[PDB]
Amino acid sequence: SGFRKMAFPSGKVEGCMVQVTCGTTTLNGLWLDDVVYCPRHVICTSEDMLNPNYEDLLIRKSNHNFLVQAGNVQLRVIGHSMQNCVLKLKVDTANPKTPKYKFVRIQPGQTFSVLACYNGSPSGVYQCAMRPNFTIKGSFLNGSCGSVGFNIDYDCVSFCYMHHMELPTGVHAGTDLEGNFYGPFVDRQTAQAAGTDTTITVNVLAWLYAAVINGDRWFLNRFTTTLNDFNLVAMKYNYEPLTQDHVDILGPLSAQTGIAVLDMCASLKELLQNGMNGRTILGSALLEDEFTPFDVVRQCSGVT
Amino acid sequence: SGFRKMAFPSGKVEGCMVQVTCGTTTLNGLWLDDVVYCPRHVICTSEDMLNPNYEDLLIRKSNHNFLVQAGNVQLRVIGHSMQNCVLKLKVDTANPKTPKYKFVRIQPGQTFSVLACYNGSPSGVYQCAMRPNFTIKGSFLNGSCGSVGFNIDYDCVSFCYMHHMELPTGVHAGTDLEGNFYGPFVDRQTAQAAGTDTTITVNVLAWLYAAVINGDRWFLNRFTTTLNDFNLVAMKYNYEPLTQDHVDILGPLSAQTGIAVLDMCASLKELLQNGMNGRTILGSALLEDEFTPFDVVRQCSGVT
Numbered sequence: 001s002g003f004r005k006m007a008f009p010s011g012k013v014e015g016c017m018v019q020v021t022c023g024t025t026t027l028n029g030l031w032l033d034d035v036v037y038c039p040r041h042v043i044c045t046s047e048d049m050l051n052p053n054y055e056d057l058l059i060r061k062s063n064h065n066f067l068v069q070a071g072n073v074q075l076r077v078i079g080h081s082m083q084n085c086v087l088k089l090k091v092d093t094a095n096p097k098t099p100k101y102k103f104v105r106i107q108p109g110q111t112f113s114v115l116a117c118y119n120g121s122p123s124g125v126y127q128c129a130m131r132p133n134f135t136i137k138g139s140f141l142n143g144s145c146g147s148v149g150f151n152i153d154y155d156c157v158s159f160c161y162m163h164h165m166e167l168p169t170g171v172h173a174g175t176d177l178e179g180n181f182y183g184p185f186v187d188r189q190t191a192q193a194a195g196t197d198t199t200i201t202v203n204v205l206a207w208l209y210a211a212v213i214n215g216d217r218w219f220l221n222r223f224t225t226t227l228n229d230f231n232l233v234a235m236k237y238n239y240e241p242l243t244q245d246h247v248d249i250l251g252p253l254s255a256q257t258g259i260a261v262l263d264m265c266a267s268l269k270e271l272l273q274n275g276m277n278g279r280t281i282l283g284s285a286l287l288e289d290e291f292t293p294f295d296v297v298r299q300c301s302g303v304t
Numbered sequence: 305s306g307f308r309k310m311a312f313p314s315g316k317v318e319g320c321m322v323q324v325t326c327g328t329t330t331l332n333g334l335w336l337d338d339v340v341y342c343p344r345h346v347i348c349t350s351e352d353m354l355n356p357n358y359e360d361l362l363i364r365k366s367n368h369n370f371l372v373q374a375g376n377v378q379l380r381v382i383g384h385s386m387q388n389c390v391l392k393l394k395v396d397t398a399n400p401k402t403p404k405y406k407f408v409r410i411q412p413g414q415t416f417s418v419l420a421c422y423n424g425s426p427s428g429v430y431q432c433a434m435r436p437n438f439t440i441k442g443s444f445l446n447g448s449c450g451s452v453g454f455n456i457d458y459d460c461v462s463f464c465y466m467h468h469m470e471l472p473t474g475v476h477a478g479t480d481l482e483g484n485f486y487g488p489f490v491d492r493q494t495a496q497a498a499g500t501d502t503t504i505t506v507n508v509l510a511w512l513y514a515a516v517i518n519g520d521r522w523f524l525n526r527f528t529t530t531l532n533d534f535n536l537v538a539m540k541y542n543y544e545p546l547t548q549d550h551v552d553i554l555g556p557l558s559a560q561t562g563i564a565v566l567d568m569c570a571s572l573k574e575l576l577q578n579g580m581n582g583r584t585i586l587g588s589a590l591l592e593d594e595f596t597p598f599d600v601v602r603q604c605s606g607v608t
């Protein structure tokens with residue numbers, strides 16, 4: 001029992017973190033096999049960030065201008081290429097700690113763990129979600145660029161995020177491991193405002209199932225609703241629309257608790273309309289949406 | 305910017321996790337040097353837990369009855385001893401992944417990361433605090449016993465907790481690495497109720513400083529208070545008394561923000577008396593108390 005915002009164990013990713021320096025800019029890189037991935041803005045000065053032409057800036061860089069350091073040993077750069085907003089630095093040594101891996105591009109609502117790093121050294125690990133506006137609410141300081149987001153399936157690390165940018169509003173923007181930004185963000189120090197941060201409805205429902213499983217049942221009411229009726233209320237509260245696919249995904253949690261998904265929807269509808277009235281659910285005074293249905297099942301079953 | 309419930313990177317502790325089986329009971333162990341630490345209740349059957357005489361139960365166990373498995377290889381047990389509520393199993397192989405370590409007994413209010421494990425395999429990592437009633441609000445399922453709590457200082461892991469028990473109320477009880485329980489709990493399946501879960505005042509204040517640093521300033525008011533006046537209100541809200549030592553510990557955060565500690569206390573007093581009024585602080589609708597002043601400085605400075 002108990003339910004916590006749990007991140008995957010980070011060891012497999014810690015063994016991949018390197019420091020990349022280009023000139024006077026230092027950030028983090030991910031060393032998988034004989035390639036080091038990092039944000040392409042490692043080639044920029046603070047003045048370059050205002051209006052960078054990466055292709056032109058990159059012409060002035062050779063293999064030897066990219067200093068890659070693993071722990072306290074220097075890696076030899078034998079190649080470099082820009083792919084979208086990431087640089088891939090070919091090194092002469094395959095990472096001996098390379099775990100089994102995949103590069104995945106996640107959808108909004110999906111959760112992942114972040115291993116925040118500074119100077120190629122891991123400082124902490126936390127869980128977050130890809131917001132419906134394609135930002136992430138992370139914890140990143142200057143030097144954290146190149147920190148990655150990932151999920152683990154037994155022994156395979158699926159890398160889904162690389163940190164690049166912090167918007168003026170304190171939210172974060174980054175890419176998948178192919179260098180494509182999530183959302184409309186661009187790696188430039190220009191005014192970029194985030195869209196509406198809607199609540200991930202399917203995740204809130206999953207977390208209400210986790211609460212029932214852990215004994216917090218006060219919010220269960222005598223009502224039911226329909227997808228159309230629930231969504232009318234969800235729209236009004238800036239909640240993402242719930243679809244039959246989301247209902248299907250909540251099937252296993254519905255079976256575990258014996259509470260039909262549309263009954264849980266009616267409970268959520270009353271929670272939105274009436275508020276919490278000073279009460280808490282799983283130690284929270286707000287409805288949590290950064291636990292997917294898969295995270296609830298994994299945490300409540302013990303997948304290792 | 306951004307502030308998350310961040311755990312330490314777990315790799316150094318993942319390399320220590322082993323599975324310990326005694327008869328038909330299987331739990332987790334911590335392998336440091338040539339010793340494996342685990343809850344002494346590994347020798348109990350479910351019926352034994354009701355009224356176990358550990359010294360007597362242990363007489364019926366020899367070195368070969370303790371099966372220690374690291375990854376998928378069996379370790380040879382050449383000795384065993386009970387120290388308080390933990391068993392120390394001497395094995396013939398020193399853990400090659402043993403990090404630099406210490407065994408520390410933490411005080412209530414102190415935070416640590418937990419690497420939840422099942423069958424010696426890490427499933428997740430989260431941050432929690434030693435509650436003032438000596439329980440921890442963790443996330444532990446059956447088989448999670450032997451999972452450890454720790455803090456890291458650069459490359460030294462300070463192990464402070466080993467998970468043993470779940471109270472009927474869903475809160476958790478465990479020991480330091482010398483086998484002494486935190487609080488009055490005993491490793492027996494008997495009625496043990498927790499005391500008052502007071503709020504860690506110094507941690508709430510630290511988190512209010514983290515909020516100011518991250519831009520959430522709405523709750524800053526025009527008032528100040530005294531330690532005596534603040535504590536009168538803190539007692540009424542089941543908040544731990546604030547002392548001059550806590551004020552001293554908040555000194556660095558007070559300097560960073562320019563907000564005197566007693567002014568932050570007055571802000572907290574108004575928050576307790578008036579509530580949040582539907583507003584949030586660092587994405588929370590309640591006052592968070594599982595971030596120490598040291599965790600705030602570390603997260604807001606980037607200690608690796």
Ligand SMILES: NC[C@@]1(C(=O)Nc2cncc3ccccc23)CCOc2ccc(Cl)cc21
Nearest residue numbers: 041049140141142164165166187188189305
């Ligand atoms: N360092 C690159 C930089 C950045 O986002 N900084 C940061 C990113 N994340 C946390 C930060 C906390 C504090 C200070 C800066 C942070 C600088 C600002 O302009 C930009 C603009 C675009 C891009 Cl792709 C990167 C950047």
Ligand SMILES: NC[C@@]1(C(=O)Nc2cncc3ccccc23)CCOc2ccc(Cl)cc21
Nearest residue numbers: 001345353444445446468469470491492493
């Ligand atoms: N397995 C030992 C056991 C335990 O606490 N179980 C658990 C501990 N933590 C999470 C659990 C989630 C679900 C199921 C059991 C859990 C069993 C119950 O009686 C006791 C009594 C004392 C002690 Cl020192 C241990 C125990």
